[PDB]
Structures are given as C-alpha cells and as structure tokens.
Write a protein that binds this DNA or RNA. Structure first.
Lengths: 134, 185, 200, 246, 445
RNA sequence: GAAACUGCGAAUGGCUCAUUAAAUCAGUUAUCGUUUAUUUGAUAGUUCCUUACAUGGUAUAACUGUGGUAAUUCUAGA
C-alpha cells in the first residue's frame, strides 16, 4: 500500500567540507510529505552514518503529490557536522542551542545609549548619585 | 536595484473590434471548442499571427540563406512536435497555411473530449480543472495545455481520482455514511 | 562464538571444498572459481557453455496436465549465498528441492517438484480459483477477495522461496505462501483496465 | 565618487562569470591582485558557481580558511582573490589541479591538470627593463617580476615559469608560425598559428592568425598570447582546442 | 593554565601540542556508529566501500584499484591475504598523510576479519606502525597520531587472547615506542599496552611483571622506560571514570608481590610507590577500600624478611599519598607500624614517623604517640634530632599539644655526649622561629 | 575579558535630478605630463674608520580620588 522510497542522485563527494552532498527524491504516494526526521533516520540507515551527521533541507512537493525533491548532506563524522553546519540547521536538528537575544530594536538602542556613555561610567554613576543627594 | 523580471502581454485586441463576421466567428469558435473568452481566442490569434509573420519573413529570404535555414527548421520542428503541423507538410508554406482551429484542436480540453474521457467539451473542461486528468504521470489542471503527440497518447485519469483510482469522493462517502447509519437505526 | 569468527569458519570450509574439488578436477583454478562467483554481479556474460551442450542426445519428455490451456510457468531453484553461506531455500526440509509453478486459464495454480532430473514433474499441491471470489462491490478500488475469478495469466516465484505471486485478468495480484499455497496477501491494480500481463 | 569603489552590482559584472540575474543584487568584486578586474575569476565564483563544491559564500570561506586552496603554489585565503588566466589552482584534499584557461565560448573553462603539469606556468613577457643596481628584470602578465632573465627575452614573448621556485625554465619567441592563444575581443578562446604581424607605429599592431581549418582572423597584439611551437602546445589545451565551428 | 573558560566563538586555534595533550586513545571509552560493526557482508569490504566513496587521494586510489580488483568476498580475502597485506604495508611505508586514515583503518579491519591467522603478519605489521609513528613526529600531524595509535588499539582489541597468551613479546616490540624520548609516544603506546595488560589474566601477568622489572634493571640509566611503565600500569588500573576495578585490585596484588620478592629492584619499588600515589590521587576511598585490604593482607603475608626497608618504602608511600581522607584505618596502620618495629628489632624510619605525626588522626595519635616516640628513641637514636626538627617543620603544634618537650628532655638525659654538636645545631636553628617558644623553654641536663 | 590606547573602516553604500547647451555624457585616444592606502611579485650584510644591544628614554589614557554647570556623546585639578 504505502511504501515510501528514498533515492539519491547527483552524489558529489566533497571532502573539503568532509561530506557527501546529494539530491534526494522521496516517493510518497497516498501520503503527504514525509518528515525530515524520518528522512534523516532512513538516510542514516542507508549511508551507515549517524542521524547526527545527516542533514537535509529544502524539500518541495511536486504538483499533485506523491513525490518531493530536496537536497541532503551526510558528513563524515558528527564532529565535522558540528564544525561546518550552520547554527540554524543544527538548532533545527537539536544538535545546538537556541541563543536568546533581544530584538534588533532593543539591541541597536542599547548600542546608541552606550555610545553616548564614555569611560566605564561608574564614576559617572557616583557623581550623579551625589549631585542628586545634594 | 535588482535586475527586473521580463514580462509580456500574451494577446492583443484585433484591429477593428466590432465586425459582424468576426463576431460570429468568435461565436462558432467559442461554442464548438468550449472556450469562454474573446481573450482566449485573441491569445491564440496573437500566437499564430506572430508565427505566420515569422514564416513569411523567412520565405521572403533567399533559399539556402543560413538564417532562413536555421530559423525555419526550428519553427517547423516546433510546430510538428506541438502537433499542429503534419509530418508530411514540413514546409514553411504549410506553416503559412496554418489556422486558429488547429491550435484550439491541440488544447487539452479538446483532447480529453475527443479521446472520450468526457461527454462534452464542458464536461472535459470541468474535469481538467477538477484535478481528474493526468498527462503521463503528472496531474494537469490547466485547460489550455497544448498536448504534444506522445502526450496525447498518454492522457488518462489521475491515480488519485475517484474515477481512476482511490476511494470515492466526499459526496459519495457522505451518502454512504448516511445510508449505513440509517440502516443501523 | 563471534559473528566474525563464524564467518571465517564458514569461509574456510568453503575453501576446503574448493581445494578438494580442484584436486578432483586435476585427477589458477581456485582464483578463477572465486572470481566467477564474484563475477555474477558485474553484468557481463561469463557463463560460456554455449558449445559444450549435447542437444542431439537431450532426453525429452512430455507430461500431460489435467486443466486446459496452461498459461505460464515459473521455476524456483535454490542457490548458495556468497556473502553469507547458508542457502537460498527457506526451511530445512528443502535443502535444494527444485520447484515449479504453473498457472492455467482454468484458474489453477499448481506446484510440482522437479528435483530429480530423471523422473516426471510430480504434482505436489494446487489451488483453484473460481466464481465464488467475485467481489460484491465489483465497482471500486477494493478487489481484495482471496482468490482469482478470471484467467490467471502470469506467475513468478520469489527468489527466496517463501512466496509465489500470480496475476491475471481479474486485475488483482496475489502473493501465496508456497507450502500450503495459502493466499497471504492481495493487492489490486486499482485500474479499470489494469490487467497483469507479466511478472518478473 | 570620492575614492575607490568597494561594491559590484550584478548586472555590471564581467559577463563570462555566468551569474544569474536574480539570485541577488551584488556580485563578488574581485580584490586587487595579479589580474585585472574584468579578466579575472574570483575564488568564490570558481568554488561555488563552477565546481559546486560549496553552496554559500560562507561555505566558500570555510573551505579557504581550512586552508585547502593554493593559487600558484601559495595558499590563498582571500575569497575574492582574482585568479586569472593561465593559472594553477590546486585542491589537494580532492587531488585535483586546475589550469584556468578559456573555453571556446569565451568563458573560463576548468581544465583538470596533472601534477607534473601543475608544476609550472606560462607568462607573457610584457615589460623588460633594467632594475636598480643594474640587474634587468622581466614583468609578466600577472604581476610577476623575474630578475636575471635570458638576454634574448623580448617584450611580447612567452616564458615558462617554474612555480616552485619562481624561476624561468625556458621561453618562446614571438615569431610567425608559432602557436597563439587569444585572450581578448571577439575571438577569445581561439587558438591558431600566427601568420603576420602588421605593425603600426603610434597605433595598435594588428595580428593575422590562421586556425587549423585555415580560417583567418585579425586581432590585436594586446590580445595575442604565444603558447607553443607549431603543433606542440606547451600547455594542455581544453577540449575542442580553440576551433570555432558553425 | 590550560584553556578552561571557553571563548564564545566557534573556530579556535589549538596548536599541535595542545591537540596532542587533549588526545586520548581508548575507542571503547569512545563510541559512535562504527560502519564495520554495522554492516556485515565482510568487515574489510565494508570499510573499503565506505572509504572508496569518502577518500579521493592518489595513494589510496591506486591501492583501491589493485585491491578492489582482488577482494570482493571473504573466501577471496582468505586466499589472497598476503598480496593484500603487502599492498597495505607498501602504501603505509609510502607515508602519505592524505591516504593514511583509510589505509590504517583498513589494516585494523583486515586483522578483524583475519584474526587468528593474522599473527604471521603481526610482527612486521607492528614494525611498519612504529616507523610511521616516528616519521609522523617528523611531519607533525595530531590526526596521524590519532589514527595510528587507534590502529594499534584496535589490533590489540581484535587479537586479545593470543597476544595475552604471548604477552611479553608485545612489550619487547613496543619498547621503542614505550621508552621513546617523547612524552606523547610514551603516553599513547603505554595506553594501548594498558588495554592489553588489563585484559591479561593473573599468571601471564606475573611472568610479564617479572620480565618488565628485569628490563628496568636493564635500562637502569634510562628514566623514560620507567615513567612509561608508570603511566601504563596506572592507566590499566584506573581505566574507569573515577573508580579502578577488580582487575585493578588483582594488578595491585601481583605487582606488590613481585616487588616484595627479594630479587626485585628497589627502583621497581619506587615505581610501585608512584603507581600507588597516582591511584590514591585519582580514585575515591570507597572504591579504594578493597585495594587497601589487599595491600594490608599482603604486608601481613610477607613482612618477615630482609625486605623490611622495602616495606618501609611502600608504607611511607601509603601514608603520605594524600591523607586520612584516603586512609581507611590508622589503627591497622599502627598495628603494621609496631609489627615492623618488632621485626626490625633508618632514615626511612624517621621519615615514616614524621609523616605519621603530620598526616594521621588525632584519635590514633592519642594512643600511639607514646609507643611512637619510644620507638624513635630506641631505634633511631642518633637520627632522633633529625626526626624532631623534621616534625617541627611539618606540623609543630601537633607534637606540642603532644609531648615534644618531655621526649626531647628524656632523649637529652639518655644521650648527650655523642652528638652535642648536633644538639647545638638544632638549637641554633630553632632559636629564630617565634613559634618554637616551648622549645626555648625546654630544660637541659 | 568590560574599559581605554593603538591599527583599520567610516571617501563605499543608499537617495535625488537643483544646477549644467561643447559643459555633462557617448564612442575614441594620450600621459615621453602625474599621485596611488591596499593586493600581488620582486627588493636593503655596507668588515673597519681614536674618549647598554641579554635590548634606551619620558610621557599619557582607562582606573583611584576632589569638583564645577539648568543643560549636551561638556569637562577642570591631583
């Protein structure tokens, strides 16, 4: 009935970034849109690497369904995966962490204010404290 | 600051708009081919006018002129693969003899109705847009699709249709649920 | 006790057999035999017995069959694996029991043993379709009645020996477990004119 | 504009880079270096757009900083380094050497190259002078200065240069009947033999060249580049060997 | 001060020596989805296909050409072992950095497939490995070292039993690497041999330890082999995260016995001292306990010989190691002390009691100080002043809360005419320190 | 690794079309008539020559501290 197929084409073994980069065809009939997690699981099974080494992205489902096409990378070791993958794609796969940062607006506003303060400021803090205290 | 896309208008209103022979011409065409728009007729009319102007200029060139030979052979093979031109008329003269009915006969809805998957030209139009007719392996829901030769051999019902495949549509299984429930009660 | 050690043991047994057979032939060669057993997956014809055959003395034998108009036949032959070294057949009774399956327009599936190249194909088991499997909807995708009801047309026996699969005009496709001939799974072709014409 | 420009638009690029017109608004402006702006190929346009070993600018920078790419034996970490013509770019982790040479269509063709041929490089002797302390030097077509040349090396020549030492293994004189590669204008990529050098004093010398099918064209001395003697090129020519056909 | 608060960034520098000092060896301590352990049509062939896809280098490409033509199946391996092995060794001797990871990986896997038949290649396999490692020193590449020593570790892992049965020859083969004049050669080669020795059982272990100690007397002048054995044995015992294991206690027992034998070198005794020091620093007391009972029991077994000073050596080690927080039972230590005193019926002796005073427990000092000082004044008579100054410098207030003054007085009474010069020197020293007031107020004969 | 000194960038980008009718600009030349950060390639033993080179000298910032003004990315004295 439902037999997903994963097949690869255009495999280019790129040892500069320590990986194999290829193009993935996923044949899903009578189903929608195989998951990236399951893609990584089965790609790791086939390529005998670790689900932490495999990474895929950019999957587009053809008009009418049953087949989606994407791009995939299989690094040589989880070490190189962590070395070269973008922070965002690691974050997606749960290998790295989401950093908390303020909005761009708060960041640029704090930057402008600190630009307006010279020195380390703590003598300024003491001076304004006592000028008010007078 | 980016490079601008190229667009282009695909039709052109004819010279003198209201002329009764052409009003009736469009009537016959729209009626027998299932169209809906003087705009669809003008689209084909514009394409063909461009084609025939190309062919005429090549004819006015000299025989064996390299430009004529290259461009003309290209045009002829394009039309032969579209299916407008028969094999045996691979000559720019028959290109000049083309017509709008040929292009409309190549449209997809006409080909469904002819091959028999539909009962009328409007039945066919509806099916196509209803997502029921897939060419080769690929569902098509554009009624203006210009099947080529081998493609017109390959048209069929889509493997997702209640007509050529999977479980019946929502109305049928809602009726089935209604009847099974009413039998249960 | 270790898988790698087990595989080494089986391989060395294989070599003992090869050397014994090479000495038998004598009464390069070993490398050649190993290379051929490899040479199966490289798809160049290597099996070159084209002229060693003795056609004039081939021994011919008809064997009549009950049903009318046998449509097709498929033969199953166990081999010995070269990655592992167990066998091709499934159970342990078999141990190289050559089978054949015939499908007949009369809606019959018939398995014979042909192990012995000197006796007639012996009719082991059979299963007959018929009219009682006609689907009650008859007008839908589902066509999944456990038997054929029209013109079984092709058969193919699985290379691992567990199933044999038949299909015909009824637009079905049925996989049987070989031993009891029991229908284990039925797949429709889901097309109004999707008749199965060949299996491979 | 009050100083040098640091940006390059995308339409304004050199055309032979084959850069799509929609992927962005800017093109890699090649940093200053051996080859001129318009007749150079930056390492990003070579590693991402031609080789497809990368997918990003940030991937290209990762490769370079991991120190894989050497342009004429020396390791280059600038991602818009202007690799030019007759250049040798080696990727060792892939075991490849590339001579950058022109394809017939005008564009830079990758030319895979073996080690013994990656060992050297041709250079168009372009300015011979007498340097300080009286040592004479040659200036080739990619900046390289080479001192103590052969006295018989004259402007407009070719010198085959050992890269490992920056020295001149040997040379080829600009005479009629040599083999010629062409690097500018309408005919660039076309290899033929040099028939005549019509020389104008105060203007531009033209050259009449004849390719193997005896088809003749006329280019400028700025655009001729002597490769090797008749029938034997000193370098390995890309496929098609510079024959323009119908 | 090694890098301990990591920078926010992603690409640090990590010079060569930094990488090597961060490097360790054990793969079983390590772990990942090993390809050869994964797929099973043959281990060599599995790694061979993975690498042909991954590696694009001249040497490995040539090697792959030849061998992929030869091997495709386990019987083919078994038949053509020699040709494959010569090819691998030819390329390894070629010494090309880009090809070595696949070549060494295939060598380890080749042994894994060919186990008990690999021994006939074993010797010159190892020769080639050591040559590669020295050349790697020449062209520094921490990656090369990682690969090479992991190939050794894997070869030992796959040929555990046979190598264990013939252990000592392995040590002879590795002694160039083991005593090599480079910290990290000593370190890594010892770690590999550490795995193997920990695997070894008791009897061959006894033979091995005897042979290695006599080798130590051979290279008495050398120190490098010495700390090589040090790091080997200490890792073999401490292998887990914080807790040596049962094989470690058996190791401690066998070493202790074969050092207490009268033919053993006293430098070897010092070696055992160092091993115990490292273990005591490493593990925690709850883990250490069975070791402690084993050592005490072995002392009780053989304390009675001319090896008494040797026992002094080891016991000084035990008491000094860190402190009572690693010491289980000072009462048992005291029993040992008095038993050794009775058996003795010197300088090491004074050192031992000084360490006892400094490092032991108050609740045992309460009932042992008296016998302790009596032992001092009886046996170490002339050295007692040595002792008492040493104890003062280590921890004075302990003896002052105890009876330094009275024992000093009685020593002065018992003997003054032999070493009055020494007495004067002591007092000359102790005058200045303002913490020695009681010593200033002691009396005289 | 905050602060501050030092180095570099801030001359590019982005925006508009007021001026400007041989001016701009377009194609075409010249610098044997000039400056050029950077990049890239080359390139600098001077042995001696009458009375520290195992490596001169003084400042200044941030900082500590005392203050001024309604107020600013103001700043004084030590």
């Amino acid at each position: 009935s439902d037999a997903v197929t994963i097949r690869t084409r255009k495999v280019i073994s790129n040892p500069l970034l320590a990986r194999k980069q290829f193009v993935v065809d996923v044949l899903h009939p009578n189903r929608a849109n195989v998951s990236k997690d399951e893609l990584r699981e089965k790609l790791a099974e086939v390529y005998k690497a670790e689900k932490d080494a495999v990474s895929v992205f950019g999957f587009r489902t053809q008009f009418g369904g049953g087949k989606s096409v994407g791009f995939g990378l299989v690094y040589n070791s989880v070490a190189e995966a962590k070395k070269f993958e973008p922070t965002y794609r690691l974050v997606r796969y749960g290998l790295a962490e989401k950093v908390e940062k303020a909005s761009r607006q708060q960041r640029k506003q704090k930057k402008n204010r600190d630009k307006k303060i010279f020195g380390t400021g703590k003598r300024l803090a003491k001076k304004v404290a006592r000028r008010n205290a007078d | 600051p980016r490079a601008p896309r190229t667009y282009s208008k695909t039709y052109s209103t004819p010279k003198r708009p209201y002329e009764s022979s052409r009003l009736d011409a469009e009537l016959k065409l729209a009626g027998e081919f299932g169209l809906k728009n003087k705009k669809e007729i003008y689209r084909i009319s514009f394409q063909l006018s461009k084609i025939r102007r190309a062919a005429r200029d090549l004819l006015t060139r000299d025989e064996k002129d390299p430009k004529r030979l290259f461009e003309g052979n290209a045009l002829i093979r394009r039309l032969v693969r579209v299916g407008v031109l028969s094999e045996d008329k691979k000559k720019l003269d028959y290109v000049l003899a083309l017509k709008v009915e040929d292009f409309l006969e190549r449209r997809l809805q006409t080909q469904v109705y002819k091959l028999g998957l539909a009962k009328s030209v409007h039945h066919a139009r509806v099916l196509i847009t209803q997502r029921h007719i897939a060419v080769g392996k690929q569902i098509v829901n554009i009624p203006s699709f210009m099947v080529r030769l081998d493609s017109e051999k390959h048209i069929d019902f889509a493997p997702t249709s209640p007509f050529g495949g999977a479980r019946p549509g929502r109305v049928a299984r809602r009726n089935a649920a209604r009847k099974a429930e009413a039998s249960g009660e | 006790e270790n898988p790698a050690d087990k595989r080494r043991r089986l391989a060395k047994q294989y070599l003992e057999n090869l050397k014994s057979e090479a000495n038998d032939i004598l009464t390069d060669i070993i490398a050649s035999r190993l290379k051929e057993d490899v040479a199966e997956q490289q798809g160049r014809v290597f099996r070159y017995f084209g002229d060693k055959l003795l056609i004039s003395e081939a021994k011919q034998s008809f064997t009549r069959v009950g049903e009318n108009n046998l449509t097709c036949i498929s033969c199953f032959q166990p081999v010995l694996n070269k990655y592992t070294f167990e066998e091709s057949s499934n159970g342990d009774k078999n141990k190289g029991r050559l089978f054949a399956y015939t499908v007949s327009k009369d809606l019959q599936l018939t398995k014979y043993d042909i192990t012995d190249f000197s006796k007639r194909p012996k009719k082991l088991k059979y299963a007959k379709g018929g009219a009682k499997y006609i689907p009650t909807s008859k007008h839908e995708y589902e066509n999944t009645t456990e038997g054929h009801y029209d013109e079984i047309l092709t058969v193919a026996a699985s290379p691992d020996g567990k199933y044999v699969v038949t299909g015909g005009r009824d637009r079905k496709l049925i996989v049987w477990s070989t031993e009891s001939l029991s229908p284990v799974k039925v797949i429709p072709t889901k097309d109004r004119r999707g008749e199965v014409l060949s299996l491979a | 504009a009050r100083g040098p420009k640091k940006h390059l638009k995308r339409l304004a690029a050199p055309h032979h880079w084959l850069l799509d017109k929609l992927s962005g608004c800017y093109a890699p402006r090649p940093s200053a270096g051996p080859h001129k702006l318009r007749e150079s190929l930056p390492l990003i346009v070579f590693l991402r757009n031609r080789l497809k070993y990368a997918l990003n600018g940030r991937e290209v920078k990762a490769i370079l900083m991991q120190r894989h790419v050497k342009v004429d034996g020396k390791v280059r970490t600038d991602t818009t380094y202007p690799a030019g013509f007759m250049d040798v770019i080696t990727l060792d982790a892939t075991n490849e050497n590339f001579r950058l040479v022109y394809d017939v269509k005008g564009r830079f063709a990758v030319h895979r190259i073996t080690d013994e041929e990656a060992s050297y490089k041709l250079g168009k002797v372009k300015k011979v002078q007498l340097g300080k302390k009286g040592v004479p030097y040659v200036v080739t077509h990619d900046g390289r200065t080479i001192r103590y040349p052969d006295p018989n090396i004259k402007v407009n020549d070719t010198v085959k240069i050992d890269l490992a030492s920056g020295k001149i293994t040997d040379f080829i004189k600009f005479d009629a009947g040599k083999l010629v590669y062409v690097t500018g204008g309408r005919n660039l990529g076309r290899i033929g033999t040099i028939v005549h050098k019509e020389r104008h004093d105060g203007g531009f010398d033209l050259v009449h060249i004849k390719d193997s099918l005896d088809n003749t064209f006329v280019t400028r001395l700025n655009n001729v580049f002597v490769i090797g003697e008749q029938g034997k090129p000193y370098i390995s020519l890309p496929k098609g060997k510079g024959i323009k056909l119908s | 001060q090694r890098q301990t608060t990591k920078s926010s960034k992603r690409y640090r520098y990590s010079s060569f020596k930094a990488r090597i000092d961060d490097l360790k060896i054990e793969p079983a301590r390590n772990l990942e989805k090993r390809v050869h352990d994964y797929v099973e049509s043959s281990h060599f062939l599995a790694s061979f296909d993975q690498w042909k896809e991954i590696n694009l280098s001249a040497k490995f490409t040539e090697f792959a050409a030849e061998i992929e033509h030869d091997v495709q199946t386990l019987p083919q391996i078994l038949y053509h072992d020699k040709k494959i092995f010569n090819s691998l060794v030819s390329f390894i001797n070629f010494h090309d950095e880009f090809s070595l990871q696949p070549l060494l990986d295939l060598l380890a896997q080749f042994c894994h497939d060919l186990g008990p038949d690999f021994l006939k290649f074993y010797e010159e396999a190892i020769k080639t490995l050591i040559n590669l490692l020295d050349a790697a020193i020449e062209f520094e590449s921490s990656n090369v070292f990682e690969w090479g020593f992991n190939c050794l570790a894997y070869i030992f892992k796959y040929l555990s039993k046979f190598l264990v049965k013939k252990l000592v020859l392995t040590c002879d083969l590795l002694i160039p690497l083991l005593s090599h004049s480079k910290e990290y050669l000593s370190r890594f080669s010892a770690e590999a041999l550490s795995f193997l020795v920990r695997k070894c059982p008791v009897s061959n272990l006894r033979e091995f330890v005897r042979s290695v100690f006599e080798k130590l007397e051979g290279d008495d002048e050398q120190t490098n082999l010495y700390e090589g054995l040090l790091i080997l044995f200490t890792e073999s015992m401490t292998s887990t995260q914080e807790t040596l294991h049962s094989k470690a206690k058996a190791i401690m027992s066998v070493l202790l016995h074969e050092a207490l034998t009268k033919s053993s070198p006293e430098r070897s005794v010092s070696l055992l001292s160092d091993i115990w020091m490292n273990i005591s620093k490493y593990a925690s007391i709850e883990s250490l306990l069975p070791v402690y009972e084993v050592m005490y029991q072995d002392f009780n077994d053989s304390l009675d010989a001319t090896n008494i000073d040797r026992i002094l050596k080891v016991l000084t080690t035990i008491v000094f190691s860190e402190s009572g927080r690693k010491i289980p039972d000072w009462n048992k230590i005291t029993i040992l002390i008095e038993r050794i005193m009775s058996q003795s019926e010197q300088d090491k002796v004074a050192f031992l009691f000084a360490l006892f005073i400094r490092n032991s427990d108050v609740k045992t000092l309460t009932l042992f100080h008296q016998k302790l000082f009596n032992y001092a004044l009886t046996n170490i008579s002339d050295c007692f002043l040595e002792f008492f100054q040493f104890a003062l410098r280590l921890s004075y207030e302990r003896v002052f809360s105890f009876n330094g003054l009275k024992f000093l007085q009685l020593f002065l009474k018992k003997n003054w005419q032999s070493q009055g010069k020494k007495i004067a020197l002591f007092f000359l020293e102790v005058d200045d320190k303002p913490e020695l007031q009681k010593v200033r107020e002691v009396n005289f004969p």
